[PDB]
């Protein structure tokens, strides 16, 4: 049941009773209230029950420490049946291993893990660097342009096409299908309300992925050598040779990977540019010390936290910081709060590119569901920033960033950038 969320000014959090703070509001990030809202919960109600929202009753866990406890304890806090606050559109549910408990989760993850293993990422690195070079060489100088479509959306589309060996000139479909899956109003308070186009996406996605399998199956029978892409790898491994005979698992986990990498990588790419503009000393420091890029990528991902939360269901009664979460209660782990928790990160709101524990961020989560594409994400941002510093002396954000409506995605729709050449 899809709802067109209407933007009302969000109240100053100090003018509310604790019981009334609703973190499911998808305009908290846009209106720059998320910070104050999460600070007050961290300090006064770090394990907080909201009895009423558009999405029903849910708990918010906002302290770094408590997020680790919940994320680690998969047996107490199930990932089934969903991993977002709300529900997917009626009859348009997709079986992803992210929304799965062991042993089933482990089997499906093992089947697909190899594609983003550092060994296989080495095979792709040259192509990802080349496709990055092309886009950056195409950008206008001394002219403000929208970074989101031009670089972030573009590089992300290419990344997903590279990974799947998807028809390169149909790569916009992977972004479009991903946006409408993860941005459904019913799931995340996103802007997407049209369920007809979502049924179209399901048909278009099941067709195109079944086609890509058959095309690769033919080239292999024709004796062509297996490539570095996911379908090649799945067709090589004997467990996943007949994966097209498990259509739920096949389309589900293919959809999971594209949803997985889409907004996440894009908003990391946009977020990084903004973070270095709001903290101009960090950019001066990055240019003098470009060996900081790897750690900066960790700090950008901590600072952005592209996915605000992940949801779980208590499998039994669980005591947590003096609160009793009841069997069946929905629990949000607010990673966006944990990565700003001064109990872990001194000066948690500042971008510090040489932050020595940057890598201890929880943007990828923690435990058996820790991000499968972490290495791919870090690679793409490292590559982006290596290629940027080669070409550009300054990256100047102009005007105000426009932010996406969601309680799940922390993203940008517009980020106006002026480039200066070296």
Ligand X SMILES: CCCCCCCC(=O)O
Distance CA 187, CA 171 (A): 25
Q: Which does 124 bind (CB under 5 to 8 A by kind): ligand HEM, ligand X, none?
A: none
Task: Select 188 or 298, whichever has its Cβ closest to ligand X.
Answer: 188
CB of 334 to ligand HEM, least distance (A): 11
Distance CA 176, CA 91 (A): 20
CB of 367 to ligand HEM, least distance (A): 6
Task: Select 348 or 373, whichever has its Cβ closest to ligand X.
Answer: 373
CB of 267 to ligand HEM, least distance (A): 7
**What is the dihedral sign for C-alpha 311, 315, 316, 319?**
negative
CB of 255 to ligand HEM, least distance (A): 10
Task: Select 277 or 298, whichever has its Cβ closest to ligand HEM.
Answer: 298
Residues 169-208 interacting with ligand X (rule: CB under 6 A): 181-182, 184, 187-188
Distance CA 414, CA 270 (A): 9
Task: Select 13 or 67, whichever has its Cβ closest to ligand X.
Answer: 67
Q: Could you tell me which residues are annotated as the binding site for heme b?
A: 105, 109, 312, 366, 369, 371
Task: Select 260 or 401, whichever has its Cβ closest to ligand HEM.
Answer: 260
β-strand 310-314 against 77-78: which pairing, if any? antiparallel
Distance CA 216, CA 213 (A): 5
Q: Which uninterrupted H or E stretch holds 374?
A: helix 374-391
Side-chain-facing half-sphere of 74: CA atoms under 13 Å? 18
Q: Which does 85 bind (CB under 5 to 8 A by kind): ligand HEM, ligand X, none?
A: none
Q: Which residues contact 77 (CB under 8 A, 6 or more apart)?
A: 70, 71, 312, 313, 314, 315, 318, 331
Distance CA 331, CA 329 (A): 6
Q: Which does 268 bind (CB under 5 to 8 A by kind): ligand X, ligand HEM, none?
A: ligand HEM
Task: Select 189 or 373, whichever has its Cβ closest to ligand HEM.
Answer: 373
Residues that bind ligand HEM (CB under 6 A): 71, 97-98, 109, 116, 163, 256-257, 260-261, 264-265, 268, 301, 306-307, 310, 363-367, 369-373, 376-377
Residues in binding contact with ligand X, number by CB under 6 A: 11
Site map 94..113 versus ligand X, x via CB under 6 A: ----x---------------
The yes or no reply on residue 257 touching ligand X (CB under 6 A) is no
The answer to whether the CB of 217 falls within 8 A of the CB of 235 is yes
**Bridge partners, 418 (sequence order):** 396
CB of 94 to ligand X, least distance (A): 7
CB of 418 to ligand X, least distance (A): 33
The yes or no reply on residue 338 touching ligand X (CB under 6 A) is no
Phi/psi class of residue 91: alpha, beta or left (left: φ > 0; alpha: ψ in -120 to 50)? left
Closest residue to ligand HEM, judged by C-beta, is 373
Distance CA 177, CA 309 (A): 21
R_g (Cα) of the chain, nearest Å: 21
Q: Which does 88 bind (CB under 5 to 8 A by kind): ligand HEM, ligand X, none?
A: ligand X
> Packing angle between helix 293-304 and helix 280-288, nearest 10 degrees?
160
Q: Which does 244 bind (CB under 5 to 8 A by kind): ligand X, ligand HEM, none?
A: none
Phi/psi class of residue 305: alpha, beta or left (left: φ > 0; alpha: ψ in -120 to 50)? left
Q: Could you tell me which residues are annotated as the binding site?
A: 105, 109, 312, 366, 369, 371
Task: Select 168 or 199, whichever has its Cβ closest to ligand X.
Answer: 199
Query: 134 is written with which tokens?
Result: 């092309």
**Bridge partners, 312 (sequence order):** 331
Residues 71-90 interacting with ligand X (rule: CB under 6 A): 83-84, 88
Q: Which uninterrupted H or E stretch holds 420?
A: strand 412-421
Q: Which does 261 bind (CB under 5 to 8 A by kind): ligand X, ligand HEM, none?
A: ligand HEM
CB of 312 to ligand X, least distance (A): 14
Give 45: exposed, middle or buried? Use CB within 10 Å, 0-12, 13-18, 19+: middle
Q: Which does 184 bind (CB under 5 to 8 A by kind): ligand HEM, ligand X, none?
A: ligand X
The yes or no reply on residue 373 touching ligand X (CB under 6 A) is no
CB of 188 to ligand X, least distance (A): 6
Helices (H), 222-246: 230-236
Phi/psi class of residue 32: alpha, beta or left (left: φ > 0; alpha: ψ in -120 to 50)? left
The residues of the shown chain that bind ligand X, judged by CB under 6 A, are 83-84, 88, 98, 181-182, 184, 187-188, 259-260
């Amino acid at each position: 049941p899809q709802v067109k969320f209407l933007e009302r000014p969000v109240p100053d959090v100090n003018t509310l009773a604790l019981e009334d703070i609703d973190t499911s509001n998808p305009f908290l990030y846009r209106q720059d209230q998320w910070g104050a809202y999460f600070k007050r919960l961290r300090d006064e109600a770090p394990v907080h029950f909201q009895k009423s929202s558009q999405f029903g009753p849910f708990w918010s866990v906002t302290r770094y420490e408590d997020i680790l406890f919940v994320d680690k304890n998969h047996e107490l806090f199930s990932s089934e049946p969903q991993i977002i606050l709300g529900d997917p559109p009626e009859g348009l549910s997709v079986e992803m291993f992210i929304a799965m408990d062991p042993p089933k989760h482990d089997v499906q993850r093992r089947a697909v893990q190899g594609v983003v293993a550092p060994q296989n990422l080495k095979e792709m690195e040259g192509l990802i660097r080349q496709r990055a070079a092309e886009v950056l060489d195409s950008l206008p100088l001394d002219k403000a342009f929208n970074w989101v479509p031009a670089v972030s959306k573009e590089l992300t589309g290419r990344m997903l096409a590279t990974l799947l060996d998807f028809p390169y000139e149909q790569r916009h479909k992977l972004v479009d299908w991903s946006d409408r899956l993860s941005g459904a109003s019913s799931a995340t308070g996103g802007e997407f309300t049209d369920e007809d186009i979502m049924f179209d996406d399901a048909a278009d996605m099941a067709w195109s992925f079944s086609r890509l399998w058959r095309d690769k199956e033919a080239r292999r029978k024709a004796g062509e050598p297996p490539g570095f892409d996911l379908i090649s790898m799945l067709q090589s491994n004997k467990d996943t040779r007949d994966l097209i005979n498990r259509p739920m698992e096949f389309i589900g986990n293919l959809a999971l990977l594209i949803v997985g990498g889409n907004d996440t990588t894009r908003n990391s790419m946009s977020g990084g540019v903004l973070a270095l503009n709001q903290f101009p000393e960090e950019f001066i420091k990055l240019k003098k010390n470009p060996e900081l890029i790897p750690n900066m990528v960790s700090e950008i991902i901590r600072w952005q936290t592209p996915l605000a939360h992940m949801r779980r269901v208590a499998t039994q009664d669980v005591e947590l910081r003096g609160q009793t979460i009841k069997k069946g209660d929905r629990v949000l782990m607010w990673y966006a709060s944990g990565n700003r928790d001064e109990r872990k990160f001194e000066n948690p709101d500042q971008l510090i590119i040489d932050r020595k524990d940057a890598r201890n961020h929880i943007s990828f989560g923690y435990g058996i569901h820790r991000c499968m594409g972490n290495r791919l994400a870090e690679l793409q941002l490292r590559i982006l920033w290596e290629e940027l510093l080669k070409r550009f002396d300054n990256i100047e954000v102009v005007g105000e960033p426009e932010r996406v409506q969601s309680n799940f995605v922390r993203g940008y729709s517009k980020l106006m950038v002026k480039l200066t050449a070296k």
